[PDB]
């Protein structure tokens, strides 16, 4: 029941990443991909709790 808006660079390797996305550092967020011809396993699902 907590939301954390922390869109910073994830440090995976031992090399620090301060503002630069290196080989060992990746953004935690990745985008969606929606097409009308997609199947059941790729269709959007609007979820409310």
């Amino acid at each position, epitope marked *: 029941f907590e939301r954390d808006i922390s869109t910073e660079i994830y440090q995976a390797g031992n090399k620090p990443c301060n503002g*630069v996305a290196g080989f060992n550092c990746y953004f935690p967020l990745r985008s969606y991909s929606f097409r009308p011809t997609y199947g059941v396993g790729h269709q959007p699902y609007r979820v409310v709790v």
Partner: antibody
Amino acid sequence: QLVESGGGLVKPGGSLRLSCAASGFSFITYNMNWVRQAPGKGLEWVSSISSNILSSTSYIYYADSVKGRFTISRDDAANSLFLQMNSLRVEDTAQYYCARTRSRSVRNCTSATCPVDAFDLWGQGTMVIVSS
Amino acid sequence: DIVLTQSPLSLPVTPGEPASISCRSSQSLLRSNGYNYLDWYLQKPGQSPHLLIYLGSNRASGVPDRFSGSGSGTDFTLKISRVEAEDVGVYYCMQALQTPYTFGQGTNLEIKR
């Protein structure tokens, strides 16, 4: 960037409507910018924008002339970046590249100067002419 | 503003011979962080520029291993192991600071047939 609109003959006292379009891409979480180029060798960065998801949008970087006469806005709903101006003193030939920065995270950035990583999404298709 | 001129002419490059282009920055870099902050670009005329080397000494955007930047401080340079017909285009070194972003002059590196 795949296709962009805008272009034609505009009087120096007129205004231009610049818009760059693209395909399915992370438009929201990337920082875009406008760069114009001379017919000879050499580009010239003319505008830039921030991203609302990372932080607030009150970190826009401007030069003197483009603060005086230019502005940049984003729709925040689709894949479209908008550049607007009102006054044209000396602007004959330019390309208005709809590039973007390779920085999905914003750190140690103020409203004056902070580094950017790289540009890899240059776009072409906007030609400007002034002659009537 | 940093004064920055690369080579405001056409530099002949013979095939099979390495070519190097150098630029110097009036202001010291690396003030924001320990990593070097300068990007290398290649702009072939007609369609679109292509990115080769980003900040530091690394590789990205599918750059061939022939391109390799080097140098630090007020001494910057490139190195291409083998030039090709697709290597024709203007080059720029661009530091990631100085928000009034002034640009340098491109260098033509056409193959000397």
